[PDB]
């Protein structure tokens, strides 16, 4: 399938250059999968996601997406227009409160909430929590995320955004999950994306437009930005019987674009997330 005029993330995703406007995937758009966004939660009755999206959990006085930032995220994962795996099922998480903010204790029940709550969902082609989050170093938070992706679930997770090295952020660090740097439209790290050994793959994260609350959609930049990507890739390659939740992060840096980016400092993975997908 060819998407004409998509963001350009969504077509760099899918290509083996820059500067093109076209994203090319399989039809079968990661149906059957789930993606678990742990964020502000999502503004579920937005247009973009056709009713594939629905709030679980929330630790706070409502699921609504006050802020706008895990809509963000979710549209970059699963919406018909701004999105990678346009036929996966979302699920929302709201840890962050509406100014995006969020204890570290209410973000470690929030993945352990989701390594149980898969199996009160139906995902037969597997199972992906993407979290675009993160704080300063916390063995606790680390290992929430380890417990989560040992459990079954595909963890993407946020490089963070202090042009820095990744080992001191949590769960950056943390070395089972798939941890996501950013991009920019011309092949560059982008400015403000941490980076480092425990960096697995890069995903588009300058100037990503997706959906937002009120209805609307907006460009905003991060390596929040980046992480639905690939949890979105990993949820299509999933649907398409390529890989697994244990597996679909080496699985995406094995296939990946490779040596295509520039300003990556010595020791840290050139890769940019590629669906490989031949029309």
Not at 200 to 205: E, L, N, R, T
Not at 237 to 245: D, N, P, Q, Y
Request: glycine content about 12%; aromatic content about 8%.
């Amino acid at each position: 399938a060819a998407q004409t005029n998509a963001p350009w993330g969504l077509a760099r995703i899918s290509s083996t250059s820059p500067g093109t406007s076209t994203y090319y995937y399989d039809e079968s758009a990661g149906q059957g999968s789930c993606v678990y966004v742990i964020d502000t939660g999502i503004e579920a009755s937005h247009p973009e996601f056709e009713g594939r999206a629905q709030m679980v959990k929330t630790y706070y006085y409502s699921s609504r997406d006050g802020n706008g930032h895990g809509t963000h995220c979710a549209g970059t994962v699963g919406s018909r227009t701004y999105g990678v795996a346009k036929k996966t099922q979302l699920f929302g998480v709201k840890v962050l409160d509406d100014n995006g903010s969020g204890q570290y204790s209410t973000i470690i029940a929030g993945m352990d909430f989701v390594a149980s709550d898969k199996n009160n969902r139906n995902c037969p082609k597997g199972v992906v929590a993407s979290l675009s989050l993160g704080g300063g170093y916390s063995s606790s938070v680390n290992s929430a995320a380890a417990r989560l992706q040992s459990s079954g679930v595909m963890v993407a997770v946020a490089a963070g955004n202090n042009n820095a090295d990744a080992r001191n952020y949590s769960p950056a660090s943390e070395p089972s999950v798939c941890t996501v740097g950013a991009s920019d439209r011309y092949d560059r790290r982008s400015s403000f994306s941490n980076y480092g050994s425990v960096l697995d793959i890069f995903g588009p994260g300058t100037d990503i437009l997706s959906t937002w609350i009120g209805g609307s959609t907006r460009s905003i930049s991060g390596t929040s930005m980046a992480t639905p990507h690939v949890a979105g890739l990993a949820a299509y390659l999933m649907t398409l019987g390529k890989t697994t939740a244990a597996s679909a992060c080496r699985y995406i840096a094995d296939t990946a674009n490779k040596g295509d980016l520039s300003n990556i400092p010595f020791g840290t993975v050139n890769l940019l997330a590629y669906n490989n997908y031949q029309a």
